[PDB]
Design an enzyme around this catalytic site. Structure first.
Site: not given
Lengths: 292, 292
Positions: A44, A107, A133, A138, A161, A203
């Protein structure tokens, strides 16, 4: 060997937006020199969204060739299409990465079952360690704990993550999974606490500009020294915050450019740190001693 | 040409997940037959996330060639990368679409300014009508009313598909824009109120299974026949609700296959309507008269 402070590396672009390998190399030497445990390339913070599939493997390959096995190199290869995640993942593997970081489908909002099938398929399709993740802020979808534990039983899924920045959540993934399933922080501000509860690393975006301090913070936390951890932490806290006054990585690149490590390049739809936010981030860098 | 009942068309897949052209044809004939105002091909409901670019144009092209210019054909071309959005937009134009549908950047969370530059670039880069799409519940970001007014002044950005379902929001955009900038609904249950407020259409999911009813609903609504619109609507209301029992397009595809119109094929990470939702959606279809 994958844990501790893992920089979520930025992808430097020149003024034209074209990839800049010279800067890429200094950022790697920077992290090879200052103690970073792992490098996450093309995730990202590395602006995965605006990179050709071609630029993407080439960034993985040059970080991998530059690191020479001295440290793990994890490649971002998640996608909101299971077929594409396989392809990008397959590409990282036969590219040299030591593991791949895969964000949950964004999405399209898959069901919890679809997320399991999605990741089980990638895990089964490509012989390479894979870290999940989770970042609902997001993707607009949340992988629940039950789904993580299910996935934790899959052969190649080595960890997760967790970015919600929710400790109640993290604790809950940690109580439900085997000791051999590593839980990482995706939230720089509260990573210290995640590690004290059992987490195996961070991270981070903060590691981009303060690698040494972040590996010191991780070692402490992961060694039980809760007092050193929270001390480095509250000392880093304003940088943590400043590094997010605008969506990431708009700020971290600004800082990186200010330390002379990368050009002023960023790809649309991202913008350069807008003027009104320069001095707060500048203040936080001076206090924190990363800038003089 | 572009307004009224605009079906957000599904892309049929056969059981092994391959494109089904015969079934696409019936859906096109169905909508041409039952009075649909326009067709949105390859958007969210058409599962854009899981279509190569090869399939993307193959689909736009086939709908366009079957439509033979009688109804507008809007193709989805948004991406979270400005360069990819231009690419997809160019393929659409040079493919026959009459307009393109562009969702806002979905995972990188660009600034409001970044969203302006991004859409401005696509509009200057490709000579074809372009409609903005704002649906924060998927994209994790929200284009503000002031960014819509600014973009409304760009030559060929003809409108916006507002999906919040927040009417205060729809009014604000309507009040701010010129009357040659059209506001469309992205929320089936409240589309009637959006049009009664000045809106010019509904890029509808419910229209997939009830083209005729949605066309009539939009006509009344857009005429000013509030009482007729809302009556058609509370009537349709249980279908609106059921069609989202699980992330769209999961439910609508089930409905379409029960009707004999498309196969049972959906692409990962999506899953087929989970067993416990079948009867509530079957009930709603029977209550609305779509299924006898």
């Amino acid at each position: 060997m994958i844990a501790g402070s893992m920089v979520a590396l930025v992808t430097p672009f020149d003024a034209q937006g074209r990839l800049d390998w010279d800067s890429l190399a200094k950022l790697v030497d920077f992290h090879l020199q200052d103690g970073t445990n792992a490098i996450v390339a093309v995730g990202t913070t590395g602006e995965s969204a605006t990179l050709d599939v071609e630029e993407h493997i080439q960034v993985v390959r040059r970080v991998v060739d530059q690191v020479k096995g001295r440290i793990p190199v994890i490649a971002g290869t998640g996608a909101n299409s299971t077929r594409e995640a396989v392809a990008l993942t397959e590409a990282a593997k036969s590219g040299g990465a030591d593991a791949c970081l895969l964000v949950t489908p964004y999405y399209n909002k898959p069901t919890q079952e679809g997320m399991y099938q999605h990741f089980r398929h990638i895990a089964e399709a490509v012989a390479i360690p894979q870290i999940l993740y989770n970042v609902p802020g997001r993707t607009s979808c949340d992988m629940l704990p039950e789904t993580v534990e299910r996935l934790s039983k899959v052969p190649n899924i080595i960890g997760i993550k967790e970015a919600t920045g929710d400790l109640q959540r993290a604790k809950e993934v940690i109580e439900r999974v085997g000791k051999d399933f590593l839980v990482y922080s995706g939230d720089d501000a509260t990573a210290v606490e995640l590690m004290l509860l059992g987490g195996k690393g961070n991270i981070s975006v903060t590691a981009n500009v303060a690698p040494r301090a972040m590996s010191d913070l991780c070692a402490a936390a992961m060694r039980g020294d809760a007092a050193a951890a929270r001390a480095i932490n509250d000392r880093l806290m304003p940088l943590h915050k400043a590094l997010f006054i605008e969506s990431n990585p708009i700020p971290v690149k600004w800082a990186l450019h200010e330390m002379g490590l990368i050009p002023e390049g960023i790809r649309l739809p991202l913008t350069w740190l807008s003027p009104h936010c320069h001095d707060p981030l500048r203040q936080a860098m001076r206090q924190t001693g990363v800038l003089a």
